[PDB]
From a paper:
Ub is a small protein comprising 76 amino acid residues, which can be enzymatically connected to various proteins, including other Ub molecules, through (iso)peptide linkages, giving rise to biological messages, so-called “Ub codes”, which are read out by specific Ub-interacting proteins. The Lys48-linked Ub chains serve as tags for protein degradation by the 26S proteasome and interact with the proteasomal subunits and other related proteins through the hydrophobic surfaces of each Ub unit. According to crystallographic studies, the Lys48-linked di-Ub chain, one of the simplest units of Ub chains as multidomain proteins, often exhibits closed conformations, in which the hydrophobic surfaces are shielded through Ub-Ub interactions in chains. In contrast, our prior NMR studies revealed that, in the major conformational state of Lys48-linked di-Ub (hereafter simply referred to as diUb), the hydrophobic surfaces are exposed to the solvent and open for the interactions with Ub-interacting proteins.
We found that the hydrophobic Ub-Ub interaction in diUb was reinforced by cysteine substitution of Lys48 of the distal Ub unit because of interaction between the cysteinyl thiol group and the C-terminal segment of the proximal Ub unit. Thus, we evaluated the possible effects of the substitution of Lys48 of the distal Ub unit on the proportions of open and closed states of diUb. We chose cysteine as a replacement for the Lys48 residue following the previous studies. The HSQC spectral data showed that the Val70 peak position of K48C-diUb was quite close to that of c-diUb, implying that this replacement substantially increased the proportion of closed states (56% at 25 °C, pH 7.0). This implies that the positive charge of Lys48 of the distal Ub unit destabilizes the closed conformation. However, serine substitution of this lysine had little impact on the proportions of closed states (75% at 25 °C, pH 7.0), signifying that, besides the elimination of electrostatic repulsion, the thiol group in K48C-diUb is a stabilizing factor for the closed conformation. We identified the crystal structure of K48C-diUb, which closely resembled the previously reported NMR structure of c-diUb. This crystal structure exhibits the closed conformation, the major conformation of K48C-diUb in solution. In this crystal structure, the thiol group of Cys48 of the distal Ub unit is in spatial proximity to the residues from the proximal Ub unit, including Leu71, Leu73, and Gly76, implying that atomic contacts of the thiol group with the C-terminal segment of the proximal Ub unit stabilizes the closed conformation. The increased proportion of the closed state of K48C-diUb was further elevated by C-terminal extension of the proximal Ub with a hexahistidine tag but was counteracted by carboxymethylation (CM) of the substituting cysteine, i.e., Cys48 of the distal Ub unit (K48CCM-diUb), although the C-terminal extension did not impact the proportion of the closed state in wild-type diUb.
Residue numbers in the entry:
A (entry chain B), B (entry chain A): 1 to 76
């Protein structure tokens, strides 16, 4: 299924995901496409930060859902 | 100075802050106004999560800047 991943800075990523994908697996897909290390990524749905070991299914993420991506950078 | 704090769910909070305020002190102001515990709050500027012990000055937060607020909820 297609989901959108949007930064708060004006970039939309489209991903093909499975409902059984963990949030960490989605971060790996974002690294594959955009080169951002999973350790720096924080994914958000419905205003809440998502936990790495839960699945898209666990969070009721449906086709065409939008996740937001923000970074946790150690340097800044 | 005035800043905006916006959720990703359609709520804008206006705060009066000082540039020497820590990010934790801003979370305390959000708790005072909205009743959200600081421990659940994550504040974001320019697509990056902000660190509790740094100041608005440290992050170049200017008058009329917008921070985003997301929650880290242990249960959901």
């Amino acid at each position: 299924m297609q989901i959108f991943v949007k930064t708060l800075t004006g970039k939309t990523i489209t991903l093909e995901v499975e409902p059984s994908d963990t949030i960490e697996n989605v971060k790996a897909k974002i690294q594959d496409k955009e080169g951002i290390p999973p350790d720096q990524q924080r994914l958000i749905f419905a205003g809440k930060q998502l936990e790495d070991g839960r699945t898209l299914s666990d969070y009721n993420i449906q086709k065409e859902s939008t996740l937001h991506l923000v970074l946790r950078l150690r340097g800044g």
